[PDB]
From a paper:
The AAA+ ATPase p97, also known as VCP (valosin-containing protein) in mammals or Cdc48 in yeast, is a homohexameric ring-shaped molecular machine that together with partner proteins controls a plethora of essential cellular processes such as ubiquitin-dependent protein degradation, maintenance of quality control or homotypic membrane fusion. It comprises four domains: a flexible N-terminal domain (N), two AAA+ ATPase domains (D1 and D2) and an unstructured C-terminal tail1920. p97 is an essential protein, with orthologues in archaea and all eukaryotes. Biochemical and structural studies revealed that a C-terminal fragment of ASPL is necessary and sufficient for p97 binding. This fragment causes efficient p97 hexamer disassembly and spontaneous formation of a heterotetrameric p97:ASPL protein complex.
To address this question, we determined the crystal structure of nearly full-length p97 (residues 2–766) in complex with ASPL-CΔ (residues 313–500) at a resolution of 3.4 Å. Protein complex formation was induced by an ASPL-CΔ fragment that, compared with ASPL-C, lacks 53 disordered C-terminal amino acids. The asymmetric unit of the crystal contains one p97:ASPL-CΔ heterodimeric unit; p97:ASPL-CΔ heterotetramers were generated by a crystallographic dyad axis. We found that the overall structures of the p97:ASPL-CΔ and p97-ND1:ASPL-C heterotetramers are very similar (r.m.s.d.=0.66 Å for the matching α-carbons), indicating that the N and D1 domains in p97 and the eUBX domain in ASPL have similar folds in both complexes. However, the p97:ASPL-CΔ complex buries a larger surface of ∼7,000 Å2, suggesting that the D2 domain of p97 also contributes to the assembly of the heterotetramer. Overall, the structure of the D2 domain in p97:ASPL-CΔ heterotetramers is very similar to the one previously described for p97 hexamers, indicating that ASPL-CΔ-mediated remodelling of p97 hexamers does not alter the conformation of the D2 domain. However, we found a different spatial orientation, indicating that binding of ASPL-CΔ to p97 triggers a drastic reorientation of the D2 domain. The movement of the D2 domain involves a 141° rotation around a hinge located at residue Leu464 in the D1-D2 linker region, indicating that p97:ASPL-CΔ heterotetramers expose different surfaces than previously reported p97 hexamers. Interprotomer contacts between D2 domains via arginine 635 are critical for efficient ATP hydrolysis at physiological temperatures; in p97:ASPL-CΔ heterotetramers, these contacts are not observed.
Author numbering:
A (entry chain A), D (entry chain A): 317 to 499
B (entry chain B), C (entry chain B): 13 to 311, 318 to 426, 434 to 494, 512 to 584, 598 to 612, 616 to 760
The structure:
């Protein structure tokens, strides 16, 4: 079905020549008169929200899920290796966790190795290969850590390490699908 | 110059808000903001406050979060040295180096009372493959063993910040650290420690947050701040809790004035204490002055004197003083209306008994430290627990925790205390073991009982009839007509009747402290004339309660008061002084004649056999009380009716052969209650008094 | 004899309860009871009351239903001639013969105003393959065409009961039938007609149901019934609705006493009306006396006279009279405390503004007659509709219904009226078309505005400064400082300020009736000294409101009052009489000098160019108001900052080649606001006044 | 899987020789003193119920469904023909509507005929053959009416009409599974 369109990035490969972000004065951190005026309106609205107790309906949920799936038709996933290397790939929201694990075994140093994926903090391991990326909160874009029983085994792959790119470049592939659709 | 940065860095400029996720390293953002910054879920970000202090947290998406807002919990807010509403700057920092080694030490006051290895218990599972971002000077907490332990990060390699890899070495060598002033306690009250009312909090935040946090901008904003607020509801609702949290989250100084406590002190010393209280708040301003139990002040000369002094201090607070006065009580009506008028206390918030959905929040708050068994359903407990305010559920979780500990030094091993699990049975126990049977729904009534309805006790009846037309204590075996006599009085005196059992005075967990003690007398006063009836006065023992009863008592009189007990021996004789209640009336088991009258009275409602001898029923039943006598007659009928219907069913069926047959001389079988009905109905059980006891009742008066 | 049947037939002896299923032929039972009687779901049962009247209904299982209880709706209860709490007997009757033919005729008052064939519209789909059990004399209802039509069953073949088969012939020949006395209207109020409060109903049922239904057993039960009850909340909450429903469901007589209406009548005629009212209730007892708007009576001589008369009648009601007095008002505090004391009105129930979940119930109740489009989500409407009481949502559904009818005799065809569907757009329309902008959250404030902050209007300033240190009407083009002047006064007079727009006086649907009119003045009185500011007095026109304003006004004075309008021509001159407000102050567009002062005042906060001529800005902007002048300066800054940052971004990038280079003589580019910033910022739009109008403002005074 | 154990009953075949149910006096329909005392306790409990607003949890629902399925392990269904004849059969709670429709086609005069099943009042036709008897509220015991486009077609079957029994007898087959389990 989908094109994975894989890439690999590492913090070292980032140019890291960037100019320092300008340090900020105390003025930036203090509020305008209108800020207070707006902040008050936040408290008022939240108060009124709790008072009337709006109805959450099953029709609304299904409608919100739909408009959410339509907003992000393609899901971007990043598997972070213990060696700091990052494996990036694209997925459909209805893709499973197993589909991700198979995607990992593909680019590995060998499929023979046993491993596991998890999200942090705290450590939560994904046991369910049936589970979709949507209900696993891997949506729309998520970072996943790769664990293993014998981590000395998982090097990812050397050939891909030659194709490895800058993290800032990997984001420009993602930013396309985030601010806009597939093209 | 300014508007540039705020416009230029506008995507990076966010305002702090309360967080859903209670994790230490987790902050939440809105999905559009997440995308705008090109942020992945679980990615690392850097936060910076006005204090120049930084932090490193993992970012997650939140649908409930506003775009302009960021939400972080207590732990993060303190590490950034910021509070709710404050402005921070955020950048998506990918680089962060995996820690080579780190150094972390516990805070001394949190670790008091335990032995063991805190690494293997707390820090080990906490940092294991969680890849948590960590910066120097950070203070986080780990929960376990009925305890919340704070840990401080001494130094990191590299610095200031790093993340903890499975390859990172955690150095725990050292001594527990003394606290620092700049870092407020996380065992100090906050919003996250208040369950059951979000709304009431939002109402309070709306009024007091901005005037306390920055009054000078709130000044120019033009809206007029409340000078005082009246919190009301039953005790243990979180009113004092709310006051402490609000003042804390706003960074405002907090001064507590206890209503009774300040009232004790001698004339002129009290007035001097109010003045010092307000002056100190004005000195430490912005500040919150909390007055606990305001009805103990303004609901003699000195009585008014301190009230007028209070009104001066209240009216003496200008907006520039940056002081907001909070006060708590039961109902606003109990407070002098002079206080509730505009300009002093303008607004009032109702802190009530939480609903089921609310009690779940409270439970979740107090179980956070303890490890729960998998069979524990807290929401189901919430449904089972009724009429519970915050203090009760807190006491519930505290007790239930102890029960598990009761399976087993003065100083406990940290490992086993942490591994201890609290089951549902532990809760069912704690919910069972100690609690009334309070609130209790006390009901005013006008009994239709007369002297006629009461069999026997003629010697007693005449005595009571003379006394009317200061108090009475009925004592004797239970079920002989103690209560019936009380109503016969209320009917003859043509007054209202109020029945109350002893523990109804006490609260849950049989608390000796009772505000409700006078509350009964109040409604006993509301109705009039009225007969106040204390059932089971011996149940007062789960002390302070007995006296405060005598006070209220003597304070009035027209209200008539009647005590009743089946165990008078343990009743404190001080309640029995002649000035209070003269008559001590002993009601014995109904004698042979009395039983005949009782049995007759019950059997007059349904047909009776020819062979039945009532005097013989009075024989075969002696140790019987009135309750038993009225019961044995009901069973007899029950046996009589079941026998008739199975006979009546037997006929209906036997007519299936020939329905057409009608026999006129053959009549309907007449149901009758005969001797073997009573003979059989005498089994059901049991509840009898010892013959020894009877003497103790007779030998009582002395 | 009795206890036999009740024990023998105990499985068949049930008590009536409110039903979930609103269908005509459906009754609900508990699953264990369903099994005990060997009843299938959807099976036919027979019901019988004390009245000997029978009924035949389809039985369904309900998990919420008690075992001892049976639930049936209004339609069934009346056909059995029983009410809530009554006892019925039930048997599982399988036999029922398929109807060969039946005869059914409509009730006259329900069919008023329509032409068409009622069979093909109502009865046809109702009876089509529904296999409904039907008995003679039964009165059911079918809903459609914004209407509920009642049909009576004249006769059945066979009789008394049968079921309607597709082979059954329905005979509709005849004339609409006049109502009968024994059958109460189903357009008469009931519990099922009350949404948004179940709880408040349960509280009322608990107190008044049993004393009203059967007082004699409630007498012997011993508990003391409430003599009176105070219902409170805003208007249109269902208080009068509740009173009518409770009295109806209990079968108690209902008497309404309108508070103002009875107060109008001359001295001695009023007192005579109370006496007649109570005497009539006592005659028709058990009865409910509903007093509408009690604060119109007891919140002069005759003022107290009727109150004392009321207290006599209240205290003159013994429990044996079987009369319960209900009264409605805004808040219990507005009522004389002498009424709220024990023995007269003991208990009070809060009927409040319903939450979102509650408004859904109300919607569902009023849409039951109308056919809804599939795109209509009522729960989503419930979220969109705020601050709406029952009367408002009822008015909402009524209006939304009309909108659909607005697509198109004085008498309408029944077919097309029934086929008419109401869409969501119809609701969005009705929710939009008429409603404020009311409640409105009126806020007391203390403005920091001074005379300095207001540019120009020096001739006006001096005038105002003289008047202080009876009222004022500001008029002129909008945005020239009407409101600013009002606050400058409040600050100089050192008083409170209250801003209120015209429609805030009116309710939703721009109702001329306003209780809140005085409510503003009340808080204007609560605060003191205070400046009451009416913004857009011309908006009062959506009459009665104008007068009641003048009354309240004259009633006091220290409260100062200031009106403001951009369209004074339509303001009723009666409000302008010299006795009320003398000064009429015209505020024109700021002149050339005034604009310079205004522009300067705004531009003092940020750097300005060397080439910019302020006097020239006062030229290029003339028809500009103060609102425009303060806006055009904000846009200029916005253009200035966006230009600077895109320049500042341009540099940050161009430094990527050589970061190491530092040039000391090269300085930071200084942001400046120049002429072409204002030139470009002049576009945004628009809102100008006609030159014709200016004359009308000048020519106003007369 | 399950044994249908079919039977057919008709109101005519009911003996209908039964003695009249005794008519009842007005005493039976009037309340005891204690009735009022109990009725008051009903209002009180319902009031307190609405005040505290008990939590309905997904765990409780699933628990209630389970104890409901365990209480009635076998479902009894009755299809009522327009000719008044009743077709009775036993089903599992997880059986579908289609399984019922197939059960009907079995005993018909011919499978060739087109028909439909529905529950009343009001008329609600079961379109979903995937739907289980549980979620269709056919549980534990339900009566279903049989509709058809050309009803003159459906006679049920003549051979079964010879095996047809009394309705009172058909209930004794059901009462076994209702008051008690499968045996
Ligand atoms: N809403 C609540 N959430 C959590 N705990 C509560 C709440 N309300 C009360 N408590 C518990 O009750 C105890 C007493 O609260 P406090 O406010 O001091 O007394 P009161 O409520 O009578 O003013 C506190 O220790 C607190 O743990
Ligand atoms: N002297 C008596 N005559 C008739 N009935 C009695 C008598 N004493 C007790 N009973 C029955 O026993 C029950 C318990 O009576 P009560 O006075 O309420 O309890 P106690 O005497 O233990 O306070 C009552 O319901 C009443 O019917
Ligand atoms: N809870 C409610 N459910 C349904 N309709 C309501 C409710 N409350 C008010 N209404 C509508 O508001 C109208 C006015 O109600 P009423 O009780 O007569 O006035 P008030 O509530 O001011 O006493 C009624 O016609 C009714 O249709
Ligand atoms: N004379 C003035 N001087 C300075 N600013 C003014 C003047 N008149 C109006 N403004 C600006 O226009 C805006 C509208 O003023 P306001 O008095 O609230 O409206 P209106 O005059 O239509 O009642 C204010 O925010 C104020 O900044």
């Amino acid at each position: 079905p989908v094109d994975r369109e894989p890439v690999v990035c590492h913090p070292d490969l980032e140019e890291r020549l960037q100019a320092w972000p300008a340090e900020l004065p105390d003025e930036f951190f203090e509020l305008t008169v209108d800020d207070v005026r707006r902040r008050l309106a936040q408290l008022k609205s939240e108060r009124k929200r709790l008072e009337e107790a709006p109805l959450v309906t099953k029709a609304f949920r299904e409608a919100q899920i739909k408009e959410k799936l339509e907003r992000y038709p393609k899901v971007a996933l990043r598997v972070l290796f213990p060696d700091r290397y990052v494996l990036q790939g694209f997925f459909r929201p209805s893709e499973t966790v197993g589909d991700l694990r198979d995607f990992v075994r593909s680019h590995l140093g060998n499929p023979e190795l046993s491993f596991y994926l998890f999200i942090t903090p705290p450590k939560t391991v994904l046991d369910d290969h049936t589970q979709t990326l949507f209900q696993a909160n891997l949506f729309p874009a998520a970072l996943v850590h790769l664990g293993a029983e014998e981590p000395a085994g998982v090097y990812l792959e050397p050939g891909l390490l030659e194709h490895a790119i800058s993290p800032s470049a990997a984001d420009v592939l993602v930013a396309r699908y985030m601010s806009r659709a597939a093209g | 110059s300014t508007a540039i940065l705020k416009q230029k860095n506008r995507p990076n400029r966010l305002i702090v808000d309360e967080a859903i996720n209670e994790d230490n390293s987790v902050v939440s953002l809105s999905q559009p903001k997440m995308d705008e910054l090109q942020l992945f879920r679980g990615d690392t970000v850097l936060l910076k406050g006005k204090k120049r202090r930084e932090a490193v947290c993992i970012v997650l998406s939140d649908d409930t979060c506003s775009d302009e807002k960021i939400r972080m919990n207590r732990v993060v807010r303190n590490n950034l040295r910021v509070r709710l509403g404050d402005v921070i700057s955020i950048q998506p920092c990918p680089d962060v180096k995996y820690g080579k080694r780190i150094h972390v030490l516990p805070i001394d006051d949190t670790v008091e009372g335990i032995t063991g290895n805190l690494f293997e218990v707390y820090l080990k599972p906490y940092f294991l493959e969680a890849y948590r971002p960590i910066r120097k000077g950070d203070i986080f907490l780990v929960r376990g063993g009925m305890r919340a332990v704070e840990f401080k990060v001494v130094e990191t390699d590299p610095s200031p910040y790093c993340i903890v890899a499975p390859d990172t070495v955690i150095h725990c060598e050292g001594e527990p650290i003394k606290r620092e002033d700049e870092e407020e306690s996380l065992n100090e009250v906050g919003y996250d420690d208040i369950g059951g009312c979000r709304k009431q909090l939002a109402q309070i935040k709306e009024m007091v947050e901005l005037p306390l946090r920055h009054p000078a901008l709130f000044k120019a904003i033009g809206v007029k701040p409340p000078r005082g607020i009246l919190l009301y509801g039953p005790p243990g609702t979180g009113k004092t809790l709310i006051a402490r949290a609000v003042a804390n989250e706003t960074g405002a100084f907090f001064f507590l004035i206890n209503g009774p406590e300040i009232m004790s002190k001698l004339a002129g010393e009290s007035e001097s204490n109010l003045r010092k209280a307000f002056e100190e708040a004005e000195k430490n301003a912005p500040a919150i002055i909390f007055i606990d139990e305001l009805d103990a002040i303004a609901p003699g000369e000195v009585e008014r004197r301190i009230v007028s002094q209070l009104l001066t201090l209240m009216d003496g607070l200008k907006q520039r003083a940056h002081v907001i006065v909070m006060a708590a009580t039961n109902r606003p009506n109990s407070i002098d209306p002079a206080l509730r008028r505009f300009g002093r206390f303008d607004r009032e918030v109702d802190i009530g008994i939480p609903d089921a959905t609310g009690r779940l929040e409270i439970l979740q708050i107090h179980t956070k430290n303890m490890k729960l068994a998998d069979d524990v359903d807290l929401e189901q407990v919430a449904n089972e627990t009724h009429g519970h305010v915050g203090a009760d559920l807190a006491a519930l979780c505290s007790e239930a925790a102890l029960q598990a500990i009761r399976k087993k030094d003065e100083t406990i091993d940290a490992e086993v205390m942490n591994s201890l699990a609290v089951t549902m049975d532990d809760f069912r126990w704690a919910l069972s073991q100690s609690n009334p049977s309070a609130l209790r729904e006390t009901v005013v009534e006008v009994p239709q009982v007369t002297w006629e309805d009461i069999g026997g006790l003629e010697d007693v009846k005449r005595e009571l009839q003379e006394l009317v037309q200061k108090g009475v204590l009925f004592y004797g075996p239970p079920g002989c007509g103690k209560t019936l006599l009380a109503k016969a009085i209320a009917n003859e005196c043509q007054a209202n009747f109020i029945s109350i059992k002893g523990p109804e005075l006490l609260t849950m967990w049989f608390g000796e402290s009772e505000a409700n003690v006078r509350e009964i007398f109040d409604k006993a006063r509301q109705a009039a004339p009225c007969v106040l009836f204390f059932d089971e006065l011996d149940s007062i023992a789960k002390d302070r309660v007995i006296n405060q009863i005598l006070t209220e008592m003597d304070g009035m009189s027209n209200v008539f008061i009647i005590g009743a007990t089946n165990r008078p021996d343990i009743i404190d004789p001080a309640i029995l002084r002649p000035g209070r209640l003269d008559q001590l009336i002993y009601i014995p088991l109904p004698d042979e004649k009395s039983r005949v009258a009782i049995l007759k009275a019950n059997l007059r409602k349904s047909p009776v056999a020819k062979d039945v001898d009532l005097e013989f029923l009075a024989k075969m039943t002696n140790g019987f009380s009135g309750a038993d006598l009225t019961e044995i007659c009901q069973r007899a009928c029950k046996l009589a009716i079941r026998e008739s219907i199975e006979s009546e069913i037997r006929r209906e069926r036997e007519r299936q052969t020939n329905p057409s047959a009608m026999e006129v001389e053959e009549d309907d079988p007449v149901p009758e209650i005969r001797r073997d009905h009573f003979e059989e109905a005498m089994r059901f059980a049991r509840r009898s008094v010892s013959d020894n006891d009877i003497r103790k009742y007779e030998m009582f008066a002395q």
